[PDB]
Structure formats: structure tokens, C-alpha cells
From a paper:
Ten fragment hits with low-affinity dissociation constants (millimolar range) were identified. Their scaffolds and proline-mimicking motifs were used to select in cerebro a set of 52 derivative fragments for subsequent X-ray crystallographic experiments. Apo CypD crystals were soaked with each of the 52 fragments. X-ray structures of CypD complexed with 14 fragments were obtained. The half-maximal inhibitory concentrations (IC50) of the 14 fragments were >5 mM in all instances.
Cyclophilins are peptidyl-prolyl cis/trans isomerases (PPIase) that catalyse the interconversion of the two energetically preferred conformers (cis and trans) of the planar peptide bond preceding an internal proline residue. CypD is localized in the matrix of the mitochondria and acts as a key regulator of the opening of the mitochondrial permeability transition pore (mPTP), which plays a major role in calcium efflux from mitochondria to the cytosol and can lead to mitochondrial swelling and cell death. Cyclophilins adopt an eight-stranded anti-parallel P-barrel structure. Their PPIase catalytic groove is formed by a mixture of hydrophobic, aromatic and polar residues, including Arg55, Phe60, Met61, Gln63, Asn102, Phe113, Trp121, Leu122 and His126. The existence of a deep pocket contiguous to the canonical catalytic site, called the ‘gatekeeper' pocket, has been revealed.
Residue numbers in the entry: 44 to 207
The structure:
Amino acid sequence: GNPLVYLDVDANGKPLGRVVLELKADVVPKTAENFRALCTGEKGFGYKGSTFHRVIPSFMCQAGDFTNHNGTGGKSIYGSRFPDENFTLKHVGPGVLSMANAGPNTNGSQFFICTIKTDWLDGKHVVFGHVIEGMDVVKKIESFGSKSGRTSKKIVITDCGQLS
Ligand SMILES: Nc1cccc2cccnc12
Ligand SMILES: Nc1cccc2cccnc12
């Protein structure tokens, strides 16, 4: 079936717990595969040791810039960027996993987990999964955000990988 992957997250050197994500490879196989391999680190790079750099309460938690660590960077397993696979999955509510981008067809490695229904991103951001377990951790991360997106704690993906 669809891969299950995990992110173990620290805030200020203290463990918050684990976020488990289902990657909808059945709908967006290319997008799912990229995120899966970046969790395992099997291509020589990935999410391990990178941060949630932009968090906005009542909106979303963003991460995945493992090259520049500031929201300008990241890269995919295919190359620096890859196309929007489709917009079939919708931003239906809290727990939705979606690709951050800098406009059409600029997917790399940055992603976000929604804390509300972000329906206005439908057709603009590629949704590729959702939170199976660990919304409690996501709400903690959300609480360390701000209006500007600047985080009030240093939030780090200490470990990540594939469960199935
Ligand atoms: N099937 C699901 C279970 C729990 C949360 C979800 C969030 C978005 C899409 N699907 C979801
Ligand atoms: N892939 C990306 C996602 C979100 C923001 C970005 C900003 C600059 C370059 N790439 C970006």
C-alpha cells in the first residue's frame, strides 16, 4: 500500500514526539516517492537534522529546507525542482500534508502540515498525504509559530524514515 513515514521532532533540544504521515502514492506517486526517499535519506541527503523554519498559528507548519535552512532552498530526488503532479487531493482540513512552492511547477523538498482547512491553496499546492498520528506534536509546533512565520523555539527533525 501507500508508504507510511515519520518525523521525530525536537523543540529547543527536547523531544515533542513523532509525526507519522501517509503518503498518497496511489494519487501522486512521483510526489510521494520524493518525500519518502528524503525521509530515509537513501540518496545521500534528506530531512534528517533540518528544521521547521516557518510556522503560522491557525494556518500551517512548514519545513524541508535542508540546504539553506531558511525557506529559499531544498532539492528533490529528481533534481532541484519538479512539476505539480496534480491537484486531485484537496486542502480539506487539519493534518493535510502539501508541497510548499514558489509558484507553478517549483516543488523541491519544502512541505507544510495544515492546522486548518486551507481551501484557497487548492489547485496551487500539491497535496500528497496527511497526518496518521501525532497531531498533538503538530499543535505543539504550531504554538511555537507567529504571525510572520518566525518560530519562537528551534524546531528540528532529529530523525525521520519509512515505517512501511
Ligand atoms: N483520512 C483522513 C484521516 C484523518 C485526517 C485526514 C486529513 C486529511 C485527509 N484525510 C484524512
Ligand atoms: N521550493 C520552494 C518552496 C517554498 C518556497 C521556496 C522559495 C524559494 C525557492 N524554492 C521554494
